[PDB]
């Protein structure tokens, strides 16, 4: 049976655009019903890497389970959670993606972070995250203290280092910075490692699924 996304795009649904919350829960589906120009997608602008592939891999799913891979209340004792954005407003108030967590400095430091997850389930786990690129060096230091940060994401079948590039993009939804979104499928028995000293839009909810 088709997956009805209403006014949301796959990106808005899978990242957890706050306006995509009322979507009814589904454990299986075949074919995703998406409008030609969905109103609610990447509310904070950025590049969604490998997006068409992700759309194809999620077109038919037999089992789908969202779980809190990095629980908000216990995973980030050394960092704060940003106030989100007006670009991702819900009910006239600034908010952010439900499935991601915008980490910011705690006090005068953004401490180095290392967070890992072992796929204890017997299904593949879809993990999503982002990398923030501020428009100015003032916003970079205001949020993350250090001027030159890195993000590192490594599994047994994934390894990538991300470097924020500070510059004004054309304004999109009143935002000249960007958050680039990435994902990988974590096979059972594999471990994913997140390392960063700034600019990490951390996973909060991941998805254990069986494709096809």
């Amino acid at each position, epitope marked *: 049976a088709p997956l009805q996304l209403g006014n949301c795009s796959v990106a808005g649904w899978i990242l957890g655009n706050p306006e995509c919350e009322l979507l009814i829960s589904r454990e299986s589906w075949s074919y995703i019903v998406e409008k*030609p*120009n969905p109103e609610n997608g*990447t509310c904070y*602008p*950025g*590049h*969604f890497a490998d997006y068409e592939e992700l759309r194809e891999q999620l077109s038919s799913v037999s089992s789908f389970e969202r779980f809190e891979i990095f629980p908000k209340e216990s995973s980030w004792p050394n960092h704060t959670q940003n106030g989100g954005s007006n670009s991702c407003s819900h009910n006239g108030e600034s908010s952010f993606y439900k499935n991601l967590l915008w980490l910011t400095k705690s006090g005068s430091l953004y401490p180095n972070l290392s967070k890992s997850y072992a796929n204890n389930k017997e299904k593949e786990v879809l993990v999503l995250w982002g990398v923030h690129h501020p428009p100015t060096i003032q916003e970079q230091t205001s949020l993350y203290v250090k001027e030159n940060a890195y993000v590192s994401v490594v599994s047994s079948h994934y390894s990538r280092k991300f470097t924020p*590039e500070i*510059a*004004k*993009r*054309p*304004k*999109v*939804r009143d935002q*000249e910075g*960007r958050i680039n979104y990435y994902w990988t499928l974590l096979e059972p028995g594999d471990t994913i490692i997140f390392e960063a000293n700034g600019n990490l839009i951390a996973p909060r909810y991941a998805f254990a699924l069986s494709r096809g």
Partner: antibody
Amino acid sequence: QVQLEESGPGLVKPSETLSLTCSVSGVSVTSDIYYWTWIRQPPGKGLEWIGYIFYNGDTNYNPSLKSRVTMSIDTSKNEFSLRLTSVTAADTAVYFCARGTEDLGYCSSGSCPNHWGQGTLVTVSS
Amino acid sequence: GDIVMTQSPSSLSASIGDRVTITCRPSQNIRSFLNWFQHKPGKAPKLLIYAASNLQSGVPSRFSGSGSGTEFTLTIRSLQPEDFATYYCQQSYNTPPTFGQGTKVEIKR
């Protein structure tokens, strides 16, 4: 913030090579996120995109001009240039240099120049 | 230059305070990869609208962009004398980038 200034207007002899330079102030031409572009407007016609160049080595020139076009970046002067060989009167135009910011969610690579110079007029004449 | 960008009209005249709409139609679907430029005599062309509908910093809110696919609209509400210019759409979907032929907006007074 960023300022772009094309080289002075003037003449090129037919079949010779047009050389223009764009002076950049406010950012480095070596930055990985910025691309540098040339556009031209012949008299009484519209805009024609010529191409872009990244410092990292990525370039793309309009197939209508690809064989005649060479762009380069001068990090010592913080400038970038356009060379156009074998010019004819069809190449008489105002030439604009411009900067864009790589933004793959909303633009093809190197395809959205959002800070332009005011342009310089090149006349092909003997 | 394979994606042809066709603007309509090629020139128009309107009074101060009028609502002005300019249409741009690509020869194929370009999703939202569509920008609008303003070009005043002797001045650098200016990006007003980015990716079909995003107003750029410092541009008066009387300018707006809408559309997707094969139909796009630039709207100037409450036309002002300083809005005399030629307006171009530009597609960023395929290389090479291509511009519309331009729309000259004149002021009726």
